[PDB]
Amino acid sequence: NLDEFLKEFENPEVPREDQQEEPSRLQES
Amino acid sequence: DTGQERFNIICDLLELSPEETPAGAWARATHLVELAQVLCYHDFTQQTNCSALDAIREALQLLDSVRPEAQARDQLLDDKAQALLWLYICTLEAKMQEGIERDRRAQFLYSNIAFNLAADAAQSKCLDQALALWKELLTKGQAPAVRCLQQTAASLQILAALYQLVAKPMQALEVLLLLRIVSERLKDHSKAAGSSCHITQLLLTLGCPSYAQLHLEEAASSLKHLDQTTDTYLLLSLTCDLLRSQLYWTHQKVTKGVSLLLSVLRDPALQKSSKAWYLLRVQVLQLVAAYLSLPSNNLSHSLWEQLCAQGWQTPEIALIDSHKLLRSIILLLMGSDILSTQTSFLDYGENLVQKWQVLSEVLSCSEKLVCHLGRLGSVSEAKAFCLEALKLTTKLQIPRQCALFLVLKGELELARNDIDLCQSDLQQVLFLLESCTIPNFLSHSPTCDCSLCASPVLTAVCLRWVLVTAGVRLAMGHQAQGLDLLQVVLKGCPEAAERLTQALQASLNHKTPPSLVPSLLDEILAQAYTLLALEGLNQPSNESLQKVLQSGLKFVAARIPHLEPWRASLLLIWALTKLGTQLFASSWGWQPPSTLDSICDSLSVAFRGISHCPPSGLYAHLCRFLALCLGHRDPYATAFLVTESVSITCRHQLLTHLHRQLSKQDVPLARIQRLFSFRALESGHFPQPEKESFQERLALIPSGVTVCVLALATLQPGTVGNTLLLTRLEKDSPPVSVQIPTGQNKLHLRSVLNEFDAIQKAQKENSSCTDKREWWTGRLALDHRMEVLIASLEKSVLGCWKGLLLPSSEEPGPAQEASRLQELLQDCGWKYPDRTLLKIMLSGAGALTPQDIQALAYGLCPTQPERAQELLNEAVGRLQGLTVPSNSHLVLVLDKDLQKLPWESMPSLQALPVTRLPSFRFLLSYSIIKEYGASPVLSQGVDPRSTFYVLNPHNNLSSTEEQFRANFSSEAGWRGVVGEVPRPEQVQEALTKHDLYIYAGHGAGARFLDGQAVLRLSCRAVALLFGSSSAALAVHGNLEGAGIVLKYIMAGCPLFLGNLWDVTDRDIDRYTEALLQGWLGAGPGAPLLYYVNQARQAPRLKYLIGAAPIAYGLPVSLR
Ligand SMILES: [Zn+2]
């Protein structure tokens, strides 16, 4: 059903998904 | 430096002696071991033409070719012991250098077993033989005949440090005892005190405090025979007092112990710049956390404020404060290669021992941090620390520590509900365990000498492995096996404690057995008991599982406050057990159209037990269950409890972040600390710490804003419940809180939350369809289902309580009935006649519907069926089309599972401005920052010339760039990047310098800007992040949400617009274009929420890519 109407629809889209502290310097003794 | 000197002088003796005579070979062997000592930490090969291992091997061969004179036996013993010791040191240094080179090549976790695992049986024997020789030297009455006993003492120190690194504390105890013997025979009173303190420290870390006290005074006695002015005296006395404080913390003498700790901290000696003190600070910072883990009942209030005043708010901060100091000391001593793959050792005796000591302390601190952080709910941070520790252990090639840091990671992976990785980690360990000695370490005799069974560390590793294995069994659905594994853990822990007790007595040679058993394995038993009780909850048929509850209760209560969070878990289990109409309905004022008294007291006790440092899940379950058992009996208490059950890990992270902020030493910072502190309140009964602290916080809402909480009340810890709690908190408004049980209706609260996941899976499946006919059919079949769902929430779940969400009518019109419909409703059957439920609904009286009125009447009025409805219906009908509503922004708060349902499109909340904040303390900290001239966006507005965009970071989406190229470029005063992945400097600048951040791409850009960089800056720009699941807090198991939004809000982000589920290109592009033109064309002073509510109608599928954008924060606008 609506197969002939779905022909006029646009091509499918694509998804928006990838689908893939510093130690301080202590003062010397 | 002493390199070239010793090099040349040792060579002098190398050429100065012959070798044929028995004395000559001996002398050459000694000269060769001194040469190995230099070649082991200095590069002179080109000038020596020898390698450390070759030199030491020749020395060993010569030494085993020597026969003594029956009077120089001791000196040969010492020389052989030192030769073996330096063979081990040089082999370990070669291992470390080649591991550093390996990391240089590769820049994993498969080398955990790749360790040759064949030298670990000879390298350990080297140290074992060294210890045997040194013992044979120093366990006899006659004075040792060694030439130099100072070097023997130093070498024993290095042996103790190395044995602590390799995770063999038992033998380190013997090494330190021989050190004490050498110290007494050499009449050095400083080394005896130092040795005695390490013997105590090691003993308390294991868990036997009686012998620890014996050794502390043994140290205190030695403290008197030395001068009272030198740095040594100050440091040793301070250490003795700190150990006394820790002992009183262990011996239920907290009151005086805290005074000793305050004296220790206040003494300026623990500030002077010295490596010995830098180490001392670590011990005090650990002891501050042992006190900070205590409840508010085992102390006074004044001592608690005194301890918190200097710093260290939550225990987690103190331990991170320690791991930082430890890493800094490592950088000072052993360069930086051992920590990162991106300085000379300078061996002068003290440095050698301190190196191994600091490595061991780093590993132990990481272990404690992982355990505690994973307990609270911060699993990600625990995994980070675990990975760092695993890398460090892999570099050193020590199998036991890798095993502990592998079972910890497995436990965390189980917490995140990732069965495969957890199983792999548990299997990597069975390999290491097999090398060290289906699980084969089981079925061992209760008493044996197995390496996995004679070492406490390995026994703990095995027990934790079995515990996590039982957990992974239970998660997979294969029960029985998991329950048996947990029984094995519960049986094995006490016998392991018994073996450790016997071992300690064997090592220390005390007559009387330990008065107090070790408490190192108590946490394992408590966790096992928790798991058994939780499993018994879902299988009420069994009685053994039922009695377990009592056994765990006595186990946790018998040691207070050693195991408080486990006591709280078992108390919540006990209360939910006694729970199973609902007794809750008799505590609120409405129902859908004693035992409880004791339950509430037990929950109150548990609340006190964990309020200061609460685990997230446990607190949320408790707070809401206490709200269920209380209801309108004490409306303030119910509101407090409900608002204390959402976003707890968020608050932990914010307190830690605030400590970092203050460390990088202002008034707003201090008041925010007071707001988020889990203990900033006066002491007293239940109200003073709970209802009052609550009211103190509740008197702070900004006037004109409604704060609702939608917490899904649970039914059993772990699963989504079928009761929902709602609290409308407002200024000058008493808390109005009710229940909306959906488990008695047609669309249960789990049906909606499972249909959401079904639609998500359908979308993920359709995402890879080529046929336009098939793809478009799926999209148009999912949009209808999402449209059905958004109205289910309004039709079935909220029911007759959307008025409590819609701005309540503060007009003087509700008053006519706020007492009229009580004098008859109470007479017709009302149990708890509340008075606010009749004023929170009058707004939009015309919008009130007769079927809404029917439920509002039946619930408010039980018993007599005629008046029950008739009166409420005629009264509300008489009050129809009364007035018009004002403007009052709304900040709905939702729980971990109710955050993903679209609650914004609900056909009652469409016109009104609606956002979503993590909690309530956030809402008030917003006002604190808003009053101290901070968060400039909420002060002036969003400048329309201060926006930064990141479009198409990777060349994948041609349609996007094609649409938004000139529009995003021509915009006046904007800057951004298109095509190329922005550099880190640029993106940090955007969120910090500008005011708006439009992201068009994949995800939220967690590739070019992670939450870590965002937390390390302050956010001055509203985040409009338009990518799939850009504002979705992924519920990876029972854990709370996680995402970039929960780290923009902590940076001070005013608002945060991100999609909740995945989106395609064209529809989200239409949404973005609509919102931008609507908001940036409206003009000065234009609410963002209003134009979002308008841009929702731009996408073609107006419910699957139109209802996705949600907002996090406080209202934003232009100037
Ligand atoms: Zn065994």
Cα distances (angstroms) measured from residue B390 to each of B322, B385, B398, B422, B950: 19, 9, 10, 15, 37
Quick one: tokens of B936? 């400039």
Give the burial class of B443: count Cβ atoms within 10 A of its Cβ; 0-12 exposed, 13-18 middle, 19 or more buried.
exposed
- Using the Cβ of A8 and the Cβ atoms of chain B, whether some distance falls under 8 Å is answered with no
* Residue B384 CB coordination number (10 Å): 16
**CA B485 – CA B439 distance, rounded (Å):** 11
Contact in structure between A15 and B781 (CB atoms under 8 Å): no
Closest partner CB to B329 (pick from A7, A21, A26):
A26
* Residue B613 CB coordination number (10 Å): 22
Q: State which amino acid sits at residue B24.
A: G
Measured in Å, residue B2 CA sits from the centre of ligand 1 at 48
Residue in chain A lying closest to B777 (CA): A6
The H or E element spanning position B1079 is helix B1065-1082
Beta-bridge partner residues of B738: B726
Q: Is B743 in a helix, a strand, or coil?
A: coil
Sheet with B733-739: strands ordered across: B733-739, B723-730, B707-713, B893-894
Q: HSE (CB half, 13 Å, CA atoms) of B387? A: 10
Please report which residue ranges of B722-824 form alpha helices under DSSP H. Answer: 749-766, 772-792
Whether residue B561 is preceded by a cis peptide bond, meaning omega within 30 degrees of 0, is yes
Only one residue has tokens 């013992």, namely B135
B332 with A12: Cβ contact below 8 A: no
Question: ∠B641-B643-B647 over CA atoms, to 5°?
Answer: 120
Give the burial class of B224: count Cβ atoms within 10 A of its Cβ; 0-12 exposed, 13-18 middle, 19 or more buried.
exposed
Q: Which residues of B touch A5 (CB under 8 A)?
A: none
CA-nearest of B21, B106, B89 to B55 is B89
CA torsion sign for B952, B958, B961, B964 is negative
Contact in structure between B586 and B831 (CB atoms under 8 Å): yes
**CA B579 – CA B564 distance, rounded (Å):** 22
Contacts of B864 (CB under 8 A, 6+ apart): B828, B829
Contacts of B158 (CB under 8 A, 6+ apart): B85, B89, B352, B353, B356
Quick one: tokens of B1075? 């919102």
A12 with B775: Cβ contact below 8 A: yes
- In this structure, chain B runs to a length of 1119
Method: cryo-EM
Q: HSE (CB half, 13 Å, CA atoms) of B863? A: 8
Output the CA torsion B433→B439→B445→B446 (10° steps): 80
Q: Is B950 in a helix, a strand, or coil?
A: strand
- Using the Cβ of A12 and the Cβ atoms of chain B, whether some distance falls under 8 Å is answered with yes
Residue in chain A lying closest to B323 (CA): A23
Q: Is B807 in a helix, a strand, or coil?
A: coil
DSSP per-residue letters across B889-920: -B--EE-TTTSSS--SSSTTSSSS-B-B-S-H
CA-nearest of B1, B7, B20, B13 to B66 is B20
Contacts of B1042 (CB under 8 A, 6+ apart): B380, B1033, B1034, B1036
Q: State which amino acid sits at residue B980.
A: E
- Decide the pairing of beta strands B947-951 and B996-1000: parallel
Quick one: tokens of B1016? 């390390």
**CA B92 – CA B769 distance, rounded (Å):** 58
In SS3 terms, B142-205 reads as CCCCCCCHHHHHHHHHHHHHHHHHCCCHHHHHHHHHHHHHHHHHCCCHHHHHHHHHHHHHHHHH
Contact in structure between B1000 and B967 (CB atoms under 8 Å): no
Number of H helices, E strands in chain A: 1, 0
User: B326 vs chain A: nearest CA distance in angstroms?
Assistant: 8
Closest partner CB to A21 (pick from B324, B1027, B1028):
B324
**CA B1056 – CA B1074 distance, rounded (Å):** 17
Contact in structure between B1059 and B1031 (CB atoms under 8 Å): yes
Q: State which amino acid sits at residue B475.
A: A
- Using the Cβ of A20 and the Cβ atoms of chain B, whether some distance falls under 8 Å is answered with no
Q: State which amino acid sits at residue B361.
A: E
Q: Is B548 in a helix, a strand, or coil?
A: helix
DSSP per-residue letters across B644-699: TSS-HHHHHHHHHHHHHHHH---HHHHHHHHHH-SS-S---SSTIIIIIHHHHHHT
Q: Is B707 in a helix, a strand, or coil?
A: strand
In SS3 terms, B440-472 reads as CCCCCCCCCCCHHHHCHHHHHHHHHHHHHHHHH
Cα distances (angstroms) measured from residue B637 to each of B37, B607, B687, B883, B903: 69, 13, 8, 33, 27
The H or E element spanning position B506 is helix B481-508
**CA B726 – CA B710 distance, rounded (Å):** 5
In SS3 terms, B588-652 reads as CCCCCCCHHHHHHHHHHHHHHHHHCCCCHHHHHHHHHHHHHHHHHHCHHHHHHHHHCCCCHHHHH
- Using the Cβ of A15 and the Cβ atoms of chain B, whether some distance falls under 8 Å is answered with yes
Beta-bridge partner residues of B724: B712
Cα distances (angstroms) measured from residue B257 to each of B118, B191, B528, B727: 48, 26, 32, 43
The H or E element spanning position B473 is helix B456-476
Cα distances (angstroms) measured from residue B103 to each of B89, B338, B339, B597: 21, 10, 11, 62
Quick one: tokens of B416? 């995140």
**CA B53 – CA B61 distance, rounded (Å):** 12
Beta-bridge partner residues of B234: none
Q: Is B725 in a helix, a strand, or coil?
A: strand
Contact in structure between B402 and B109 (CB atoms under 8 Å): no
Quick one: tokens of B283? 């011990």
B328 with A26: Cβ contact below 8 A: yes
CA-nearest of B338, B334, B404, B416 to B371 is B404
CA-nearest of B854, B847, B837 to B908 is B847
**CA B953 – CA B473 distance, rounded (Å):** 43
**CA B1106 – CA B145 distance, rounded (Å):** 89
Backbone dihedral angles phi then psi of residue B726, each to the nearest 5 degrees = -135, 125
Contact in structure between B643 and B695 (CB atoms under 8 Å): no
Contacts of B633 (CB under 8 A, 6+ apart): B587, B832
